[PDB]
Each structure stands twice: as structure tokens, then as C-alpha cells.
Design a protein around this nucleic acid. Structure first.
Lengths: 206, 122, 117, 57, 117
RNA sequence: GGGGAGGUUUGGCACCUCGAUGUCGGCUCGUCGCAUCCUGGGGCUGAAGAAGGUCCCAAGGGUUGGGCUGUUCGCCCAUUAAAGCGGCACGCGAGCUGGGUUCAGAACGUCGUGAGACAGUUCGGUCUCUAUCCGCCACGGGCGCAGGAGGCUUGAGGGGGGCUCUUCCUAGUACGAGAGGACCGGAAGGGACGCACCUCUGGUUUCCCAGCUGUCCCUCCAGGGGCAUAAGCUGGGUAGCCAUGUGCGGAAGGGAUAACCGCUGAAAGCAUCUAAGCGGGAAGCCCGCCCCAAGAUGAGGCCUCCACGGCGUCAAGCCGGAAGGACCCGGGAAGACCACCCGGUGGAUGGGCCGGGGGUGUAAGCGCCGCGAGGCGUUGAGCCGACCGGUCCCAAUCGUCCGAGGUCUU
RNA sequence: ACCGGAGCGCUGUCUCGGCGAGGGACCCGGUGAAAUUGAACUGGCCGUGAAGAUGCGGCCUACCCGUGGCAGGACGAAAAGA
RNA sequence: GGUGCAAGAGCACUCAGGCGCGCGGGAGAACCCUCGCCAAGGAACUCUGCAAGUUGGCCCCGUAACUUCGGGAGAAGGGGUG
């Protein structure tokens, strides 16, 4: 139920009697490293692995805390709970039936230090009836003398953007076994060339 | 697909071809109107010899100077506006409609007497 | 939100052309100059581009360099002393180095720019 | 119009200023000679990286 | 290895060969033939003769916005490698660069002055 | 006729503020309560059906756009499931406006011998750049978690999100003389709102390509440059950033209960839902779904790399790591500075160069046609900002400093 | 260059916002002020107190310092209430 | 002073002749000032179409109520310009 992935593009091809609108994502074959089930922990997972960055730029504790199951050398390693794998490699063609419903986790695009009008959508002052040096920044932040303080849930200008976000319940229209591409109708967040993990949740029923 | 307060032609009955839009007529804050959307309207330019003189009516919106991103993605737009006049449930004031042809103005599908009678080029 | 859009700004939007074409008349004349380092790490996209059309040949090159230098002595020097000598080399003709003294009075580090043998 | 109130202490005047201390530079020796130098520049007594370019011909 | 290498693996089972209609031109008059199909599974191959107005490219082309003057001007963009069409047939070639995105002819509606190009 | 709660209304009394506690409306942002306007769960009828009347529980979610007047209020046109009542110094002016009334000017009516005057009317009238401390929104620097480091992580706790309608199978039957017309279930599309993203439809793109006018200069014709918005004016526009564009969402389940309805059943061997026991029951509570989170002084949990040697019995004092690491440089879909991420020649990290994608739209020159403005062939050419790549041609040359010598005990 | 109503022509005043350029703000070198001020080792809610508490009472929360920002409080500032 | 604008001491370049305004260098966030376009709809914003945008020079044709016979008139509304 799992895949470590690199997003590339959104691009559309006519599939049925209309034209759908998919994305195009890749998973070249992740090798599991550690598996951790019963006695001492509960966070049970096979840990996958990414692409191949040139062995001698690598320090010794991820040399031999990585040889113990003998992959080669990663950049990225991750962990998603409650899965069992029978052997030493997971591949695209095993898990995903073409026709399921899947979901996608990735980091967003970081917009920087965006203001109020971007971050919480709410309007500003007017523009041509006398609008002396306010046009876009908020109104009040409280009420006089009975609290004596401003609340601590309050929307305000500040940072924005590159958090962890997820999308839900989008389908898996057609995969290719020859390559290791995968096609999903939807949005699939992130600046492309960035990491995306894919798990399945069809347990949402009707 | 934009009708808060607009003039649009009638291509039909009255005595002249103006109208005012008042209110889009689905639930409680609808704010816009694409085609196939019955809107309540006010007749504004004069009517010689008399049918609909200066009351207010309801009309089905036909083409709209904006894009229909159609299901296989062509997109028919025009450059005009209109709407056909509807008596208190669903009919027409006469059996003649003169605007501009098919390309599927049918697409509310409570209206077939318009698209059987929306003849040909002009 | 500067986001995948290169070629940094310095001055103004038409003072920059008269900065480029006024420091490109001096480097071709003297062989070496001395500027500030953010003014030097970007001049080599322009000065290196003129000398590529130099060795290309004909009057459709020496009429096109002339709209960037406007000197009928600099072009008839450029098309026969520095243009023949690079008929063994695919680009990358300049060289910018750092220099170990600040500019007291406003404290900006310097750079040494010259075209290579 | 946004004027202050009570003047700050010595003990909190001199606690903001705790964080303004500045760092020494970074120096390495010129290898052709025997002195210091900022470690990515041309050396203004011994001459070069590989090929002179400076210093009083 | 990125999109330039393996999204032309994906789209080349559809536009491996585009079912080759020929020579778009820029300002020519055309009659399309589409497969408008509705009304409990009835297809109705519809033809439309029309003046072409603009096109733009990146291998998901649109042989796009196409106008003709019924008496109210109706104008109809459309995909070029799509499965909708049978064939595109041109009638005659026209000229006058001022290339893609000609749109004077929306408001210069006089058909006496459309034929003076 | 009698008994009370509430502090939202015009009052009563004068206790802090006259070496100053800036007004009624309008914007912008809100959180709260219930004597509930809609959604949901129930008893009673002068409830046949569909609709209705009044009462008991219930605060999750929602409460539209306009004409007149300074208006809060009120009367109206068009819809809707409805178009709620109240507090928060009659919330909010070191956040904005100045229409209202009572600052200096002037006039109409009316009282006065007169200066003047009248909650009687009417037209004009200055609203202040720098946040010291609590409070809030985001990011950092030290010593801590008893050898020194890297990596992946569990969750105490806390936040966000919670809507609603219409048509159609059931079926037009049960119901009722008829006219009318359902409970329970079952499908589809739509409205407002929220988190992401560029392929379509649309928008910007300060120098990417062309055209045109005036005037000084390159050298006279040709061909070019500077200036006439911090672009001279007009027709186009890639990546980037967004919406008037596309994708999905709000649940299914599990428990415990509210008003209500029961099962056995005593004290009360004709009975009764009870304090002995057990069961049914809502958009409301807890768990479930995403997101931060061991700074949870209760300082968490695992796997891997180096522990070589000493010693005069005080050893918290030296150089010192295949551990590891900052300062320095070439950078970036990360960024106010630091922070994070990817590189440092056994390199493809940026600049140039080559091959594409993509913009404009048929270059200068010579040869033909016309007395001249021009036209026609070479020619879908030439110029080419960042998108995807191959290529030691130019740049990251050389180097420098801190860090265990695992403690109380057997 | 007066004051009150109504139409037409065109429009970012608006439904409802979006992108772009220059002068500041941000960082680094040079010089470098002013109104204000009892002393400060300056948390939240219930309640009392000359009757709107960071200084008193009982419980919950909080590791030592700083840099950009937004304006609720200090019955904030100025003017011995017109 | 010299050219092109129907004219001119106006507007646009520019002769002689002066000057670049006595703090600099980088990055290119929120927010404010001075600007440029936008689409579908054109006053729905508002105390008030406030502000901004529309037509804008010269020539020809044509021109209403009322009037103290001058005027209303640049009425309105149209075509031309290399």
C-alpha cells in the first residue's frame, strides 16, 4: 500500500469519450532496509529508499547501519505504518490495481512571508472616499478593557507556505509496467522534482 | 456567465430588444448565471402595439459571451446576449424565435420547444 | 517572490544598458579592469557574448556588434586582434577573481576582471 | 505620539547588548610565502593562485 | 530524464502519429467535421465552415479560436490532435503577417473591409 | 387579584474620574449566552392524508442582494429552509471615514424698544511620520536531558474541519365519497465555503520580437543608436505568480447519554419503567479523518561508526578522532538577517557553448519590375530572458580551529 | 471654480481581486538626535478592595536572552476642561 | 538663437555656456507613497459617479425651445487629416 515518488508534471490525454486531467509520477523501485515488529516497539513498518548518490560521499554510520540489510546508498528514507513485505524489493506493478482510489502526501510550495490578504483571505479598506494610508492590512484585534488582552488563536500576518499537506481520495487511472511511471487524476502538491509519498485509503465508503 | 444587473436582448416577443436583470433564481445566494438558467427580469425598452408593456417577466438565458468548457473541450462562445421569455411555468409567447442556431442551447433539458424552434443561420 | 527569474537588478531600467556598454568599451580597450563583485559576476554574460559574434565573420556580425559598441575603431581592432586568437576554444573567455582589500569609505569588496590567454 | 514610559534599568539596558559581540575574521597562510591572508583571495605580497596577475611588474 | 525524456513516452500512444490533418496555415478558411454525439447514442457528424483566427503550440495544440459571422458572430475553439474529428479541409490560403493572434476582425466587422485584409 | 427572576430599556441616589476616561451612524475583524428564526429528536389535539397550534430537550452549522433618509429603527420590490434576540465601557477612531448635532460667516419665520436669542428650518467649515513593558502572529542564539556524533521515529497534550436543497424507482398505492396525496428506504445533479495546482479557458509579463512619428549625433544614400514615464506610442508574448479555470472535501462506523418509551419487579402476593438489575434512543460529548508536538526539567524508543595508549597515590591540565565539525567559496521551487537543503575537481553546483521545446513573423545584400513611394524571388528566414538536457572551455586553488580520554558504587 | 433632483457616453468606485516598475522599509561600512520617566526582579481567570488590580487571596500555567511585524491594555502621550 | 508642429515667449529634441543637486554598497519580504494594463457587468460602491477614465487641434456640412433682437451656438450630431 506504499510508494516513494518523484512528481513531474500535469499533462492530459483523452482516455474515455472525454478528456481527463492527470499528473505523471515515478517510483523506480525502493529497497526496504529495516523492519520492526513486536517486542520492543509498536511503530511497525518496512522502511523504503530513494535514488543513488555516488557511494564515497557517505559517512560510516550510514555505511554500516545500512549494510545490515544491504541496500547500496540513499538520499532519502521514510516510514509508513502497518505493512508487510515478503521479500527485498517492492515494485509498482504489485500493489496498485488500475481502478483503485489512492492518496498523496507531500510538502507545499513555500510562499515566503505572505501577508493577511493572501494568508487568511480577508478584505481591506476602501479606495476612493478618503482612505488615508490603509488599503490592505486588517482592522481591530480586540475590544476595550474587559479582556485587557488579545486572544491567542488569532489570525495575523506572518509566515506561510512550506508546511506538510495532504490530498485525499483520487484515482489511479492507468499505470505502465514497462517503465515505472504512474498516472493519477488530480493535483498532487509540490514543486516538481520534489518528494511525494503515496498510500491508499479506500476505506472511506459511500 | 455574469448577470448581476445587465442589459440583454430578447430575440423574441416584445416590441424591442432590451431588458434589465434583477435576480438569478436558484438558491438564496447564486451571484451568477450561465445558460439554461431562468432569471427574473424587467422589460425596459418600448413595445409598439402591445404585448408585455412595462411589467416584469421571467426568461431563460441563451448565449452569454463567455466560455463553456464543454465535456470533450471545444468551447462555443458568441458575441451578443439574449434570453427567451417564459410564461408562468414553461412556454413561449409565440412560435417564432430568431437569434442563432444549435450548438446545444438545450442543456438545461427542461426546454425542448426552444431548440425545436431555434431554426438556422439568423 | 523572486522565483526562477534570473539576471539581477542594480540601478534603474535603462541606466543598466549604459552601464553594460560603458564597461564593455573599457575591458576590450585595456584588457583588464577592477569593479565591485556583484557588478563583475554578471558582466561576463555580455562581454563574452560580443567576442563570440566577433569570430563569426561577416558584415552581418560587424553590423550587429556596432549597435552595442558604436565605435568604428574598436570594431576594427576587435575583428582582427582578439577575434583570431580564439579559434581553438568553445566559449568561456573571461576570468573574475577576488582581491584582498576592502574599499574603505563604504566597505565593499572588489574584483579583478580580465580576458584570458 | 507613541511615547515611552519608565526608563529601563542598567540590568536590562545591558542585556540587549549581550548579543552584539562580533567575530574575528578567518585567516590562512599564503603557501608560496609565510604569512596570513583571507582564504580565497589574491595575496598582496606573494602573488598568485597559479599565475601572477598583480603586484608590481 | 525529466519531462523532456519521459512524458513523450506517455503522449506518444496518442500523438505518435496525429492522424495527420495537414497545413494549418494562419489565416485560411476551413470547414471542420466533428462527431457531435448525444440524444440516447446518436452521432451527428456536423460540418462548420469558418475563418481561422489564432493558434498556439506545445504538442497539446489547439487549432484554436475560429470565428464566423452568422449575423451574430459565433466562434468556436477546439483541440487539434483530438479523437473528435474526422478530417479538416481547407478551402483557400490567405496572407498578411502580423501572425498568430489576429483579432482586429472582431470589431472591424464590416465584410467589405475584411476582404481588403 | 397574588408571588418571583433578569439588568437589555426612560428613571432614583450622587461613591472614583474636571493638572482631560475624544461622540451617534458606516466600514474592517469578531469571539460569547439562550428566555430558539432554519436544520435534527420527541409527547397532546376539536391530528383521516399532506400541511397546521402549543409545550419539552438541543448551541455543531447557517442567517441574501436592492430603492428613499444622516440614520440605529420603520415602511416597501424580488427570492429563500429562514431571512432571530441580546452582552462584550449603548465591542471596535495610538485601525480608517466625518454625512449627523451645537465653534468663528450669512439668511427665512417668531418673540424683544434694544444688544442678541430659539432640540424651529437651510447652504459652508484643520481628525497628530519613529511602540519602552504585558498581549498576539512567525523565525533565531547559549547551557540543559550526566562518554561524543549522525538517522528514522511513538504519542501525553493542543488546534483546524462539522452545511444544505431539488428532481426521480418505492407509487402514485396506504389514507380518503372526492378533490388531493405520504411514513421507511434508494439514485443523480446543484448552491455557498475551505485546503492545494497549471494541462485546458482567461490576466500580468519595464526590454523577448516586430511596426510608426519628431529631433540631434554616427559619415553623405543605405543601415543603426540616445531622448520624448522612473516603457516615447500601438499590435503580440514563454517560464513565474494568481483567478472570472480544473481536483478533492465535509462522512461511513464504535461507545456513553438528553426529553421520551419499555422488560422483570418488591416495600404496595387487582398494580407501578425502580434506589436491587437490564435494554432502546439525536446535526449535541468521547474515539475515529488530516496538521504541529519530548523545552512531556515526568527531558522519551530502536539500528550503525571510532573507544589505541597512559600514568609517581588527587588525574575537573597537554597535542589529540577512519568518529564527527564551524569559519571560506559556487548556489537553490528555502529565504527580511541568521535557519534549512544540494555541491567543492576520484566535479556537472552556477557562467559560456551545442541539440531541442517556445516566442515573434517571412533579416541585411545583390539580382529582376515601376519615372518615384514601393513590389517580387534567396526564405516559415533572422533575432532569440530564465523551460528540458549533453560538454573539465571559466570559476568553488591552498588551508584553519573546537571534540571523547563514558563519572557515585560492586 | 455656488446649492437640489434625472438621463446618455465611458470607466478597478464596486461584485472581487490579480500581476508588474521605480523611491523607502530589510543587511553591511561613516556620523548620529527628541518628546516621556517614582523605583522594577512588569503572567491568566474567579472574588474583594473609594465599588473595571502585573503589586492583596485561592487554584491553573510559565527554561535564560533577542530580531522583523499587528495595535487590546498600561484608566498610555501632549494642553493646571473652553 | 535652430528645425517640425496653421501661429507664438506653449510643447519635443538640441547650439554657445554651465552643471550630475556633499553619504555609500547589496538583497530584492510584509506594508505605505508616485505610476501601467486587465476582463465578463457598467454606479450594483457611496453621505454624494467624490477620484479616475472618456471625447481634446484645424477644415466642411448641419443646428431646437425661449429672447431685453446682440444672443442661446464650440448647441447637439456627423464625416476628412499620411
Amino acid at each position: 500500500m506504499k510508494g516513494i515518488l518523484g512528481v513531474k508534471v500535469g499533462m492530459t490525454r483523452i482516455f474515455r469519450d472525454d478528456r481527463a486531467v492527470p499528473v505523471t509520477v515515478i517510483l523506480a523501485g525502493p529497497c526496504p532496509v529495516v523492519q520492526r515488529r513486536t517486542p520492543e516497539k509498536d511503530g511497525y513498518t518496512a522502511v523504503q529508499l530513494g535514488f543513488l548518490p555516488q557511494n564515497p560521499k557517505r559517512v560510516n554510520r550510514p555505511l554500516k547501519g545500512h549494510f545490515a540489510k544491504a541496500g547500496v546508498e540513499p538520499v532519502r528514507i521514510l516510514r509508513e505504518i502497518r505493512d508487510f513485505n515478503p521479500e527485498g524489493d517492492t515494485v509498482t506493478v504489485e500493489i496498485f490495481k488500475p481502478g483503485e482510489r489512492v492518496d498523496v502526501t507531500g510538502t507545499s510550495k513555500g510562499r515566503g512571508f505572505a501577508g493577511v490578504m493572501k494568508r487568511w483571505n480577508f478584505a481591506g479598506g476602501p479606495d476612493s472616499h478618503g482612505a488615508h494610508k490603509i488599503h490592505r492590512h486588517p482592522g481591530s484585534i480586540g475590544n476595550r478593557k474587559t479582556p485587557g488582552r488579545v486572544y491567542k488563536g488569532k489570525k495575523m500576518a506572518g509566515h506561510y507556505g512550506a508546511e506538510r499537506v495532504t490530498v485525499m481520495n483520487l484515482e489511479v487511472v492507468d499505470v505502465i509496467p514497462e517503465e515505472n511511471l504512474l498516472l493519477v487524476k488530480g493535483a498532487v502538491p509540490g514543486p516538481n522534482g520534489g518528494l511525494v509519498i503515496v498510500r491508499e485509503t479506500k476505506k472511506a465508503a459511500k | 456567465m455574469i448577470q448581476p444587473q445587465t442589459y440583454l436582448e430578447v430575440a423574441d416577443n416584445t416590441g424591442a430588444r432590451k431588458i434589465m436583470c434583477i435576480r438569478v433564481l436558484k438558491g438564496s445566494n447564486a451571484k451568477y448565471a450561465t445558460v439554461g438558467d431562468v432569471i427574473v427580469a424587467s422589460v425596459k425598452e418600448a413595445i409598439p402595439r402591445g404585448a408585455v408593456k412595462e411589467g416584469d417577466v421571467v426568461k431563460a438565458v441563451v448565449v452569454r459571451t463567455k466560455k463553456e468548457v464543454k465535456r470533450p473541450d471545444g468551447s462555443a462562445i458568441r458575441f451578443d446576449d439574449n434570453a427567451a421569455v417564459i410564461i408562468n411555468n414553461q412556454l413561449e409567447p409565440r412560435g417564432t424565435r430568431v437569434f442563432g442556431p444549435v450548438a446545444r442551447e438545450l442543456r438545461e433539458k427542461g426546454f425542448m420547444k426552444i431548440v425545436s424552434l431555434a431554426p438556422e443561420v439568423l | 517572490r523572486h522565483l526562477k527569474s534570473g539576471r539581477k537588478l542594480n540601478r534603474h531600467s535603462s541606466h543598466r544598458l549604459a552601464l553594460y556598454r560603458n564597461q564593455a568599451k573599457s575591458l576590450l580597450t585595456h584588457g583588464r579592469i577592477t569593479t565591485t563583485v556583484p557588478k563583475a559576476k554578471e558582466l561576463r554574460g555580455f562581454v563574452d557574448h560580443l567576442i563570440h559574434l566577433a569570430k563569426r565573420g561577416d558584415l552581418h556580425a560587424r553590423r550587429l556588434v556596432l549597435r552595442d559598441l558604436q565605435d568604428v575603431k574598436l570594431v576594427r581592432k576587435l575583428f582582427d586582434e582578439i577575434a583570431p586568437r580564439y579559434r581553438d576554444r568553445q566559449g568561456g573567455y573571461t576570468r573574475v577573481l577576488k582581491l584582498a582589500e576592502r574599499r574603505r569609505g563604504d566597505g565593499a569588496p572588489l574584483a579583478l576582471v580580465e580576458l584570458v590567454e | 505620539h507613541p511615547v515611552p514610559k519608565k526608563k529601563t534599568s542598567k540590568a536590562r539596558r545591558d542585556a540587549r547588548r549581550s548579543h552584539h559581540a562580533l567575530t574575528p575574521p578567518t585567516l590562512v597562510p599564503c603557501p608560496e610565502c609565510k604569512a596570513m591572508k583571507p582564504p580565497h583571495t589574491v595575496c598582496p605580497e606573494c602573488g598568485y593562485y597559479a599565475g601572477r596577475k598583480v603586484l608590481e611588474v | 530524464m525529466n519531462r523532456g525524456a519521459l512524458i513523450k513516452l506517455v503522449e506518444s500512444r496518442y500523438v505518435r502519429t496525429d492522424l495527420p490533418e495537414f497545413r494549418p496555415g494562419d489565416t485560411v478558411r476551413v470547414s471542420y467535421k466533428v462527431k457531435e454525439g448525444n440524444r440516447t447514442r446518436i452521432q451527428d457528424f456536423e460540418g462548420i465552415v469558418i475563418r481561422i483566427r489564432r493558434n498556439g503550440f506545445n504538442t497539446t495544440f489547439t487549432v484554436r479560436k475560429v470565428s464566423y459571422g452568422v449575423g451574430v458572430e459565433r466562434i468556436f475553439p477546439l483541440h487539434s490532435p483530438l479523437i473528435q474529428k474526422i478530417d479538416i479541409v481547407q478551402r483557400g490560403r490567405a496572407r498578411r503577417a502580423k501572425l498568430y493572434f489576429i483579432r482586429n476582425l472582431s470589431d472591424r466587422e464590416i465584410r467589405r473591409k475584411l476582404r481588403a485584409d
